[PDB]
Ligand SMILES: NC(=O)c1ccc[n+]([C@@H]2O[C@H](COP(=O)([O-])OP(=O)(O)OC[C@H]3O[C@@H](n4cnc5c(N)ncnc54)[C@H](OP(=O)(O)O)[C@@H]3O)[C@@H](O)[C@H]2O)c1
């Protein structure tokens with residue numbers, strides 16, 4: 270019995286992942302062995318494998334990817350409430366069960382080995398049980414670990430969204446696509462921005478978002494957000510531009526609204542760095558640095574997704590052979606994808 | 617019959633003129649307040665000196681946000697107020713609940729303020745002083761701006777839990793009002809200052825837990841983490857703005873709140889810090905705080921009264937022309953600890 274894993278040691282490109290056959294891991298008494306069946310990628314995996322993840326330290330001989338779902342294949346001798354065959358997701362963190370994330374030491378695919386392998390030994394306390402009536406496949410289930418957890422934290426982990434409020438999503442990446450599908454099933458009005466009109470059309474057609482705005486051709490986007498919200502502005506902004514876009518974002522937000530700061534993909538120079546304390550003081554709105562999401566939160570969002578039959582959107586699902594895995598990573602890097610890229614470890 | 621102060625040339629508070637006016641008559645929804653006590657705020661210097669951001673200020677302005685006194689007359693449609701009731705006036709006439717939506721009805725800027733013997737105000741803007749409150753009118757008045765702002769910071773969004781740590785910057789109105797409220801709600805308090813004598817005074821008078829001189833120790837975020845066993849402050853009552861925000865962020869615990877309230881520090885464009893990046897790293901929040909609603913200020917008032925909090929007034933001046941000018945010169949000096957009072961009487 271073999272565990273086929275991918276590991277990287279030279280973090281200058283995902284093309285330094287090496288397919289290895291290892292012995293089946295034994296579990297410690299408090300662990301469970303997960304047969305991984307579905308995985309999805311994140312920008313984080315590209316940043317880590319390519320050596321531009323400044324948030325935290327990354328281990329040597331790393332198995333990448335935070336996102337995995339599958340079934341229990343073995344159970345340690347102290348473990349109570351998990352059986353072989355049980356269908357599961359792994360929490361993005363081993364240790365962040367509730368409250369704020371205190372480090373990245375135990376984050377899958379970074380501080381500890383991630384999900385791009387057939388088998389993983391993990392602490393049972395990291396396990397999220399997939400409700401029994403859930404009809405999603407394993408890749409869809411995996412999709413919830415990083416983007417689902419993050420979005421639910423931004424919308425429900427500090428001051429919670431109310432039905433009827435407006436959420437603005439920057440770009441058409443995994444955070445936004447996962448976000449629009451959850452927010453729309455929670456009764457939000459949704460707005461999405463993009464550098465591409467083709468993408469905006471696609472997002473509008475598949476997900477039924479209420480308004481689209483091209484931020485490349487229409488950099489005065491705050492003003493449009495205001496037109497579509499009766500002059501009030503958006504109640505939540507899922508902010509992935511960082512300083513480069515924070516001025517527009519602030520002016521697009523209602524007073525009393527929330528800007529969930531999540532990424533910083535946008536360019537900025539010191540000369541144009543906006544005065545954020547002053548802008549936020551004038552708008553009367555909040556900013557919050559969002560850091561994934563705890564197990565408690567993520568479980569609620571999982572329960573919602575199952576109970577209401579939200580069907581996470583998967584752009585393309587690849588197999589587990591080397592050429593397939595690189596084609597999936599390549600697609601994640603290109604920026605041409607809408608939402609999630611998936612990998613079927615089994616089928 | 618009504619002595620008021622008005623300013624129309626907003627280049628200095630020395631342009632306020634004492635006028636004797638007829639006693640205002642009241643519209644049907646209004647009440648006439650005999651103003652007994654007033655307090656000053658930096659906002660009044662900013663407005664009288666012409667350096668007040670956003671807003672737009674009326675001509676012929678009675679300045680000041682803060683007032684308390686007694687109902688002298690009642691309009692014909694008013695139900696739950698009678699002559700002799702002790703009252704505070706809400707900072708805005710319109711902001712009863714929810715977030716502030718403009719400053720058109722803000723006392724001492726959009727509408728006439730409290731530096732006058734009598735004031736006609738809509739009834740819906742009145743906050744009844746509890747019957748048992750044993751505070752003077754000047755103390756009562758000090759709850760209007762700084763008190764409403766601090767309550768909003770700590771209880772208006774995600775509420776303070778007992779035992780959490782609050783950081784206050786400097787020893788002005790917001791900080792001292794804040795210290796007194798946070799202490800009486802069971803917070804650990806830390807106070808920062810440019811002077812050790814102000815710090816000794818503050819620690820002794822108010823029982824502040826930890827003090828830090830931001831001139832002696834300009835890496836004050838470090839001192840805050842040292843005093844919270846590496847955790848950080850749960851709330852920062854932030855009054856410096858961009859100038860200090862990097863430090864404040866580095867002082868804040870993961871999941872903590874930075875109440876952005878003021879803009880007093882100098883900043884140069886080349887020092888402007890990347891706030892979203894720093895916030896994302898710390899995993900903390902920033903929030904622009906715009907005074908506070910009547911609903912919330914009411915709660916703060918009930919708290920002050922039920923728990924016998926005694927707002928500190930550094931000095932109270934009389935209502936003569938020379939005394940008013942002196943009160944404004946003290947507020948503008950920076951030598952005050954907390955609040956400057958005017959006994960309209
Ligand atoms: N804080 C956390 O816990 C957390 C969790 C997950 C992700 N993140 C971070 O958040 C960001 C998004 O992650 P993801 O997986 O969604 O990434 P992704 O799928 O790579 O998203 C990339 C998309 O972002 C959009 N974009 C790029 N520059 C933009 C700009 N200036 N303004 C608006 N949109 C822009 C583009 O959309 P268009 O092509 O449509 O323009 C692009 O295709 C990354 O920086 C990631 O590191 C953070």
Ligand SMILES: NC(=O)c1ccc[n+]([C@@H]2O[C@H](COP(=O)([O-])OP(=O)(O)OC[C@H]3O[C@@H](n4cnc5c(N)ncnc54)[C@H](OP(=O)(O)O)[C@@H]3O)[C@@H](O)[C@H]2O)c1
Nearest residue numbers: 658765786787788789790809810877878879881905906907
């Ligand atoms: N958003 C709102 O609704 C709202 C409400 C009230 C006030 N404010 C604003 O909040 C600020 C505070 O007003 P206030 O009435 O409390 O002020 P104040 O009584 O005039 O406070 C002045 C004091 O602040 C301290 N200070 C000045 N620069 C500082 C710096 N760089 N770092 C730390 N402390 C500094 C000084 O104390 P030390 O000498 O001890 O350091 C000084 O004596 C003002 O900017 C005002 O416009 C806003």
